[PDB]
């Protein structure tokens, strides 16, 4: 861990891993297209409802259950 630093753990420097296909968000050039909220982030493909699967990629939102809910779904939770 932190002290204990047992086993071989090193590292330099780690990305935000996605939220939600739990890869790597690389892409170094011109142009980038990521949420972000809390810390955490969801590419614009994988920011969307996990009811109705709507893009809400930099759209309104509503987190819960560790989920994300459109305005509208929300309203049924
Ligand atoms: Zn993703
Ligand atoms: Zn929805």
């Known amino acids: ?3 204990g630093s047992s086993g071989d753990c ?3 420097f780690v990305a935000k891993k ?3 296909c739990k890869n790597p ?3 170094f050039g ?3 297209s990521v949420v972000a909220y809390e810390g ?3 590419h614009d493909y994988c920011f969307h409802c996990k009811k109705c699967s709507v893009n809400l990629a930099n759209k309104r939102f509503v987190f819960h ?3 994300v ?3 509208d779904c929300a309203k049924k939770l």
Do not use: L
């Open 30 to 32: 011109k142009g980038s």
């Open 69 to 71: 809910y459109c305005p």
């Open 65 to 67: 259950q560790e989920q």
């Open 18 to 20: 996605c939220a939600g």
């Open 10 to 12: 090193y590292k330099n």
């Open 1 to 3: 861990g932190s002290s």
């Open 40 to 42: 955490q982030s969801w």
């Open 25 to 27: 968000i690389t892409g």
